[PDB]
Amino acid sequence: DHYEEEYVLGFVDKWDELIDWESRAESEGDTIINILKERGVKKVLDVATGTGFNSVRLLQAGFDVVSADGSAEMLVKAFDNARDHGYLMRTVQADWRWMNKDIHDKFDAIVCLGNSFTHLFDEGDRRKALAEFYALLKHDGVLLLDQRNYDAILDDSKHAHYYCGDTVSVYPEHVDEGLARFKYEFSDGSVYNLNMFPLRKDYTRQLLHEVGFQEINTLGDFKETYKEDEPDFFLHVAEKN
Numbered sequence: 432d433h434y435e436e437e438y439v440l441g442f443v444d445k446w447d448e449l450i451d452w453e454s455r456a457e458s459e460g461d462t463i464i465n466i467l468k469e470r471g472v473k474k475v476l477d478v479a480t481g482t483g484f485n486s487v488r489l490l491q492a493g494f495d496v497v498s499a500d501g502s503a504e505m506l507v508k509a510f511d512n513a514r515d516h517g518y519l520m521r522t523v524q525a526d527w528r529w530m531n532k533d534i535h536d537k538f539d540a541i542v543c544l545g546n547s548f549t550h551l552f553d554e555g556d557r558r559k560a561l562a563e564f565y566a567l568l569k570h571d572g573v574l575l576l577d578q579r580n581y582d583a584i585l586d587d588s589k590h591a592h593y594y595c596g597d598t599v600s601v602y603p604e605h606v607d608e609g610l611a612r613f614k615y616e617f618s619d620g621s622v623y624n625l626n627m628f629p630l631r632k633d634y635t636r637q638l639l640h641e642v643g644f645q646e647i648n649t650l651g652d653f654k655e656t657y658k659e660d661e662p663d664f665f666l667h668v669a670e671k672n
């Protein structure tokens with residue numbers, strides 16, 4: 432699918448055109464950075480680099496970072512965004528399903544953020560991806576993996592979620608247990624529609640346990656502009672031991 436990659440490349444361009452990273456950094460806060468700091472983390476592998484926000488935040492924070500993504504095109508955008516923030520990014524093109532094909536080091540932590548794991552629609556692929564991440568971690572390593580709160584949608588909810596003030600709204604057009612389609616509308620009128628797999632919180636936790644992770648703490652993460660009783664995101668902190 433040539434067009435589908437081009438469609439998503441258009442989407443991330445729009446996201447970064449209209450949402451500046453300083454605002455996003457202020458909002459995210461330093462919870463993730465603090466979690467890594469408290470564990471004495473030095474080497475981090477970003478497996479979902481995208482246009483590089485998480486990686487650049489981590490480089491800025493002083494971590495040694497390897498930035499991987501399945502998409503060469505994303506990595507080019509990430510390297511240039513890093514360059515613009517004054518950092519040399521270490522990029523590696525790699526598919527989650529065979530990560531150690533081109534990555535030969537072990538890491539203190541792996542981050543898989545921005546609701547990325549949701550892009551896998553096959554359960555075999557999910558297991559493989561997690562086993563690949565698990566193998567890339569040092570004995571005392573940690574996996575940080577987030578996701579949208581799909582439970583809230585599946586059990587109720589049919590309204591838009593806004594991010595960075597009203598810069599973008601995210602509306603669930605169709606959600607069932609095998610597929611969520613979101614409409615993203617930006618403040619300039621741009622609309623993009625994206626498919627993803629609606630991971631239940633406990634299903635993700637179960638997968639992490641099943642491939643070998645010893646302890647998993649799931650945190651509620653309220654990112655949206657207009658807060659509800661339920662978090663719109665979950666962050667899983669999975670310790671290899």
Ligand SMILES: Nc1ncnc2c1ncn2[C@@H]1O[C@H](CSCC[C@H](N)C(=O)O)[C@@H](O)[C@H]1O
Nearest residue numbers: 479480481484500501502526527544545547
């Ligand atoms: N199977 C796979 N293997 C490697 N990378 C994958 C993948 N499936 C999706 N990705 C990547 O995961 C990314 C999701 S975008 C996440 C961007 C970043 N984490 C942020 O929060 O801004 C995309 O760049 C996509 O190329």
